[PDB]
Amino acid sequence: FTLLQDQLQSVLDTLSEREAGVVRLRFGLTDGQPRTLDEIGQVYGVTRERIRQIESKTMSKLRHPSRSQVLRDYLDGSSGSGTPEERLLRAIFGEKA
Amino acid sequence: EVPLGVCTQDPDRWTTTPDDEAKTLCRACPRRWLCARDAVESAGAEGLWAGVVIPESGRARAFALGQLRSLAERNGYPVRDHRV
Numbered sequence: 542f543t544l545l546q547d548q549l550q551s552v553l554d555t556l557s558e559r560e561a562g563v564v565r566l567r568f569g570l571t572d573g574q575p576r577t578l579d580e581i582g583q584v585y586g587v588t589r590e591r592i593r594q595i596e597s598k599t600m601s602k603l604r605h606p607s608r609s610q611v612l613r614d615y616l617d618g619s620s621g622s623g624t625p626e627e628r629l630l631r632a633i634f635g636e637k638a
Numbered sequence: 639e640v641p642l643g644v645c646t647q648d649p650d651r652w653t654t655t656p657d658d659e660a661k662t663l664c665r666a667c668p669r670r671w672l673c674a675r676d677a678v679e680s681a682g683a684e685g686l687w688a689g690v691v692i693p694e695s696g697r698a699r700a701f702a703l704g705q706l707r708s709l710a711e712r713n714g715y716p717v718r719d720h721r722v
């Protein structure tokens with residue numbers, strides 16, 4: 542069985558280096574502390590607005606079946622976890638999936 | 639199981655820099671009409687889904703999502719409206 546953590550790592554590796562880092566910071570996969578968009582601009586040295594553009598665009602890349610179709614099967618087991626991985630999954634798939 | 643779309647190989651050639659060979663592969667894709675439904679149900683779907691490059695904004699985006707909704711329903715994959 543491929544663990545959700547390992548599947549997410551492989552999916553994030555299909556993103557650009559900055560997209561992957563922004564995602565990990567935003568959902569606290571880095572250390573367990575999620576960051577605001579202002580903080581992610583702090584990092585990477587860009588405005589809050591570019592962090593927002595990157596986040597929205599990266600989220601739509603992740604939702605496309607090329608990256609989402611094998612993650613979708615983990616949603617039910619991960620929902621109600623309280624984990625950072627569940628948080629990212631729920632942001633990808635929405636709260637009605 | 640219904641197989642994965644081939645897009646999972648080289649995701650960027652569908653999400654970010656789509657080309658004609660990718661669209662050709664969508665036309666042959668076994669889950670194409672499932673993918674059309676999912677495009678309508680996904681937040682901010684963009685790029686190549688189900689053989690259609692979905693524009694990022696405007697009336698062109700409205701048309702593409704309308705077409706994908708109608709083809710999805712027509713092929714037995716009706717959109718669940720509670721999920722749009």
Ligand code: SF4
Binds near residue numbers: 606645646668688
């Ligand atoms: S129809 Fe959907 S799942 Fe199939 S190759 Fe195209 S984008 Fe991928």
